[PDB]
Amino acid sequence: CRXTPVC
């Protein structure tokens, strides 16, 4: 999942 480099 993008929008987050950690998810």
SS3 sequence of 1-7: CCCCCCC
What is the token pair recorded at 1? 């999942």
At residue 3, what is the residue type? X
In angstroms, the CA 7 to CA 5 distance is 6
CA atoms within 13 A on the CB side of 4: 3
Most distant CA pair in the chain, distance: 9
What is the token pair recorded at 7? 């998810």
What is the token pair recorded at 2? 């993008």
What is the token pair recorded at 4? 């987050």
